[PDB]
Assembly symmetry: C2
Homo-oligomer: 371 residues x 2
């Protein structure tokens, strides 16, 4: 009794795990997957299926396989809901046992099998029920998992658009301990099947406060494109008391490395929005830093994620699903690490509510009808 | 450093207090013994935990035939609840008010119970007509009528007593998962769906269906004392007994055992004999640690009394736990703080991609 807190809500700063998966070296200004810099993987054109194996296994040589033909069973109108409920439904039909009752090779195989199915579900969900499915023979001639995704969704995709997705998916594959990765590790720590953990991680990812979803910079980029001057549009947005999307406080020590590789991809692949995007980035950084010289302002990677995704004909409402597709690498790597660690994540809570009390001394007891 | 957040305090709740040292469980200060003794139905205990007071219990479920038929009752509700958001227009928690979130939690809760009853009834049987479900006066009787059509009134009191005892039990992994998702601002249907996922884990606690083979051995053997010896002699774990949770007896097992006797469960006497035989064995072979009966033992007897099969008991546990989940989700919204821990890198240092094992088997696009 008389339990009392002392200048203590949440787990901010509390270390819950140690990991060998990746290091978001924010003070050093670099992001590394198993010690491999994110800039060397994107610039040397390593496909997402191979980076998936690198994050999960710790080394190359066992990338993602082609997804088996499984037409999407859920058409809810929300791509997130379609993949969240769909992945949870894989366990009974595929005979997924709990994590406690399977070895590591089976869990790694079940994670790889579910990750490619999530990519297929997102491709089918975005194509919509108002379109006949892409034939399997056309999907089969694709050589990479990223090209398989674009073919299942678009049918005849531009190879430049496939190259753009590989740049984004790799750069968004894993970025430390967030709410969606924490949810995946907590569910997996109970010994549940890997399908339940990925399903719960998608639900946590849909939260607006999770962060990382591509920014709403397309309408602003539409104004500068036809108005001409980027400095006048950005200045007009701030002078009218509006918010600049895609720019704010710093995440890394300086420029975000994921933002540098996405901008480099937009230029290398010849994105029609690139020249306007650079002018908007230069004007936004200059105007925001000039107005508040004592505050750090950097370009969010969501700014260039929106440009790269829109270049690949990705609609704005589908961009959050594109983020979930890439994050399956980090979620799967963290689920396997939690399986080997083998300990339930269970925090505690201090009770500060009412003390012992009879039922009759509670508000609305007269409303209660006893059996 | 020790991983697992063991002992780390994450929140300060006013919902319920599992008094471990005192051996009591209270919902907003009200003992579960009084709620079960005075026959408070589950729909009212839901209101007590979520709102903090009686008055606005759970309403009858709207007609919504289950769209998911996966063969697992847990998967049917985990997927079913997540699909409620687009059809019902569930906005993110960040963009709705408190009274709307409370109604959204109450709406999805009675829908989760409706989904379990339909899933357990199975697709190979015609649905119970709505006019029969409309005859019930409590939510618990509504669940059994939609599931069994003509349920035994004693089985309704058994489920009603079990659901009250399992409604809330502090910061467990399933309740922690619901708060973590809700802290991101996601809709209440996604927080409940994720909580069911962490719920199906075997290392979460509450696996009552696993004790059934032991009770079946005693039925044909005749002497439970020698059967408990046989399980321990072969080296496998004894089901439903072991480590102490509260100071001594679990309050939920105390309530469930009393409910099994008063309602005249046919398998009560064998369960009491198995409980006596199992307690004396583990206390004799390991006399240096405190041994108590786990709640999953008497929870299985009570659930088996109400004709709940083995592959449905986990879904019955999520049904009652919706009260605790919704109460903590609503508390998490008012808190308005994103919960996330940190991790330390202990992996390899900066290296080139060509130095990684298997770079020869990678094709550059």
């Amino acid at each position: 009794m008389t339990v009392v807190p002392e200048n203590f809500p949440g787990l901010d700063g509390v270390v819950a795990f140690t990991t060998e998966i990746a290091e978001p070296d924010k003070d050093g200004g670099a992001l590394r997957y198993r010690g491999v810099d994110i800039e060397d993987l994107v610039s040397q054109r390593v496909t997402f299926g191979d980076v998936w194996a690198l994050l999960v296994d710790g080394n190359f040589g066992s990338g993602l396989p082609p997804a088996e033909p499984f037409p999407l069973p859920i058409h809810s109108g929300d791509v997130r809901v379609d993949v969240q409920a769909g992945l949870a439904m894989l366990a009974p039909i595929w005979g997924y046992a709990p994590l406690l009752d399977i070895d590591d090779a089976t869990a790694r195989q079940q994670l790889a099998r579910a990750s490619v199915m999530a990519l297929s579900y997102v491709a089918q969900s975005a194509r919509g029920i108002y379109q006949p499915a892409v034939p399997q023979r056309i999907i089969d001639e694709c050589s990479t998992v990223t090209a398989e995704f674009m073919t299942r969704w678009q049918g005849e995709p531009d190879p430049r658009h496939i190259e753009a997705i590989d740049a984004y998916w790799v750069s968004a594959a894993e970025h430390g301990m967030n709410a969606s990765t924490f949810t995946a590790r907590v569910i997996a720590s109970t010994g549940a099947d890997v399908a339940a953990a990925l399903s719960g991680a998608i639900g946590a990812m849909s939260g607006p406060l999770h962060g990382g979803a591509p920014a709403r910079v397309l309408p602003m980029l539409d104004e500068v494109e036809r108005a001409g001057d980027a400095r006048s549009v950005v200045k007009g947005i701030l002078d009218r008391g509006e918010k600049l999307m895609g720019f704010g406080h710093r995440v890394y020590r300086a420029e975000d490395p994921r933002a540098r590789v996405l901008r480099a991809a937009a230029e290398r692949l010849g994105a029609p929005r690139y020249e306007v995007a650079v002018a908007v980035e230069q004007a936004a950084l200059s105007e925001l830093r000039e107005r508040r010289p004592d505050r750090a302002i950097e370009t969010n990677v969501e700014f260039w994620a929106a440009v790269v995704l829109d270049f690949a004909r990705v609609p704005a409402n589908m961009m959050p699903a594109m983020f979930t597709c890439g994050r399956t690498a980090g979620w799967c790597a963290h689920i396997l690490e939690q399986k080997r660690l083998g300990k339930l994540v269970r925090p505690s809570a201090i009770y500060v509510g009412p003390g012992p009390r009879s039922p009759e001394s509670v508000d609305g007891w007269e409303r209660v009808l006893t059996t």
